[model samples]
Target: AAESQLKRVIETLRRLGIEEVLKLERRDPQYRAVCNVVKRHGETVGSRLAMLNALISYRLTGKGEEHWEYFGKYFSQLEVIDLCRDFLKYIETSPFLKIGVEARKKRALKACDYVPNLEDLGLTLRQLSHIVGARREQKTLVFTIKILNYAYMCSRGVNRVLPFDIPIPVDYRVARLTWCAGLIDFPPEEALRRYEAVQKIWDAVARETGIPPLHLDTLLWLAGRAVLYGENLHGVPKEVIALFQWRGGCRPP
Candidate 1:
């Protein structure tokens, strides 16, 4: 498994026509090979989207640690129809911002009702967004596209290929990675243009990689995240690992 994934990284780089690999002098080649192993994981679409879907819940549940913990404890007790019921209870005692009690409850109810209707929604990502009433920043609409595509690809789920027309979610991880990779340049003043730039970068990479415009978001997002840095280390110090880290706050969403 390790050997094949390392080969995947080398092949991925070669396919992009890049001869240069990151190096810490002899150590970097092997080190980055390991990093690629962590970056490119083999997850079934069903499992990935299931967890991702749950995480997209709009709750101001405590810190990241607490948020994950809450989901773990709560989800263990749920049935298929208990999503709204349990979700309403999940954030009942937590602090919140956008949605008040009634609004949040209403949204949860709507989510449960509308989820089964995704099949009948229009073909485009925008259409899916409209059905779910999600804005770009929240990323639910964009993430849903990925969820659907992987589901479609695996031939495993109800919402089939809405397609690569589903661009990257273009949230914090994406913005950070693409910006650092010099694929895009955006100041705080020009924030609105970033997603368009992200799409363009992915399109270019897709062309060179011999795939039709596909999702490079997962690839780069894995690269830029600090969480997976441990996989890249081969007795390297923590400070050295910081070299690949970006200062943005975005997880897989």
Candidate 2:
């Protein structure tokens, strides 16, 4: 029954152009250790109930730092916020405002007497405004989609080695696209095109280059880290970066 269900899911995924499902059996071994950890520890670090509350707080406040205290016990609020900001920056060419608006709404609806922190609100608004400004002149959707596709590929590749695991959410493709829009400023059409282009690039590289597709995916993950952390990819081999750039449709400086 389980095998049949897996087969049905694979069929549906293939129909959706998510053909990567076919490779799961072959790749399962690579992810086995990490999968074991996730199974034993669950997807989040803390209690499942706490994690749910944290997610709710995150959604309501767009303040990852505060929520992280409730969910991951290991990170400082500032660190958590920083990490989320870094993730946002990696995929967002522009800053997003929806978070602040949502936060404000939550505050207002909750009838909290606390005034919104202008500094934090200003930072989010400024970033979102810049993103909106950048999008006004260009196709934001495509850029967003491309960046998200790259991020997803990168995440999956890295999970191969990481000791901890978090299964990409069931609606990961759509969720990621939605997250991108909410976290950064992008137009719908542009995001879709960019995502398609990124996928095309991945396919082209896999077909033409001798390097394994997973390697390219891993390189993209590293590149995202490099971009987010402002760290130089000094030690990463030139060939890898070259291939990634070629596949990513973006040349390195």
Candidate 3:
């Protein structure tokens, strides 16, 4: 089942190519809103990292069902991103970047200690996001490494094109999609471990398909959502081979 499913996914990737894979409408709106904000801000660490941080926060909401048209009421209405934007109001303004800059300098204890500026914000925030979420050791909400790599390499800022090891932000959609597609396993509350699993396969497919892992991650994420919900994803047709069901080997619970 795994082999058969892998074949289907790769064949779809080859047939569709990276262009069509990334051509889905739901995927487009995210980059549209996010990239516009980045472009408006010019090349600043605060905007870039804040963009990434906002994505991380958005993922925590698991709003796989909607994109920019997502106008549902949050808080009392089960809408988290809208609620976050209501209160946080830091996406483009990037409070995290500002806070991080000050925080790092303060922690630079000795004269010998390096006080890096916002230019190397990627290096700085990678260390900070783990200590940077709403709660300490809250691995799920704070996808430090995952968000960092995707931000730098995939949806990059205007001035920054830095590269780091990438990890797929394997939340419910990513995990279930990969698990059902036979790429990775679903977690039992512990999500990062399974996220790590899908990362490896994403890396392999990225190389094999000549698609960047981040792009592939987005395509796979879209594919996953389509498989689970056939509502708005009219763009992803039934011909999408990865949407096929394979149950001989690994079955999603």
Candidate 4:
């Protein structure tokens, strides 16, 4: 089932066309808006700020739009150094915010230690990403890498291009999509232990498709939303959507 399903996944993506999917990725309004904000303030520690944003991005109870809107407005007035210097003030001042406030506050404080390192261009972007702490295969780590990729692509003076070996950042969205789609046969309870398993499938898909894992994530994220969250992603095919069906109830097992 896994092997045949894997083939189905690959063939589905092939029919969709990698270039076309990437074009759709570029056309995503959220992607455009986030990248624009990063690019606008990228003259200094734009990439570093992206990492900071990724750190706070986790433990969310709401959608990404709220987070982006908050950061977009915050960065419009402040820069990286200001956040590091006065993170508590940023937290106290933030309103219309209801997710990850405490964790983000703690992360912001811990992140202050790395400001000097983040500002140093001598360190590579990969090194900077790890300066605070980014573990391989961890969702937060992979999420940080995703933002860095965005920063490097759009932000000026963002240091070096992301290394080619970065893997897909498997979160609830990707895991649910993979399990329901039958790409990997595992109980949802084991999702954490199976992170590497999930990554192996996408890594192979990346090689077969010639679309690097990180870049290929743009499509997976959107399509996964359509399948698992009932979002109406524009370019994803209905056939692909049909491949995903919850075996039990609507909730992930």
Which candidate has the highest TM-score of all?
A: 4
**lDDT, ranked from best to worst:** 4, 3, 1, 2
lDDT of each: 0.40, 0.29, 0.43, 0.63
Query: Model 4, 1-253: lDDT tens per residue?
Result: 8898888777766766655655665555445555766666663455555566676766565566566667666766665556465545666566634565776777767665554233332243345455546566577666666665555545543323333477787876677777877777786557656788888888988777666676667776666667656776666777766666634443322
> What are the per-residue Cα lDDT tens digits for candidate 1 across 1-253?
3234323333453343211111221132212222222123322322232323333544444333344344434443333245455556655643432346666556545554343223432343554455457653335555555434443333322222233344555555455555443344464224334566666555555544533232343444335434343243333333323322333532223
Model 4: lDDT equals 0.63
TM-score of 4: 0.78
Task: Record all residue pairs in model 4 with backbone atoms less than 3 Å apart, i.e. clashing.
Answer: none
Leading candidate by lDDT? 4
lDDT per residue as tens, model 2, 1-253: 3234323322322332213322331232212322332233433321222211222232323333233332323221213223333323322321222454444333223322222221232332234224334331122222222222222233344322210111111112222332221321344355444544334333443444332333334333444333333344443334323322222223334
RMSD per prediction, one decimal?
11.0, 16.2, 9.1, 4.2
lDDT tens string, model 3, 140-221?
3234333333334333532232222444455555655666666543442344554555666666666666665555655655
* Pairs that collide, model 2: 94-131, 95-127, 95-128, 141-190, 141-191, 142-190, 142-191, 142-194
How many backbone clashes does every candidate have?
0, 8, 0, 0
Higher-ranked by lDDT: 1 or 3? 3
Cα TM-score of candidate 3: 0.56
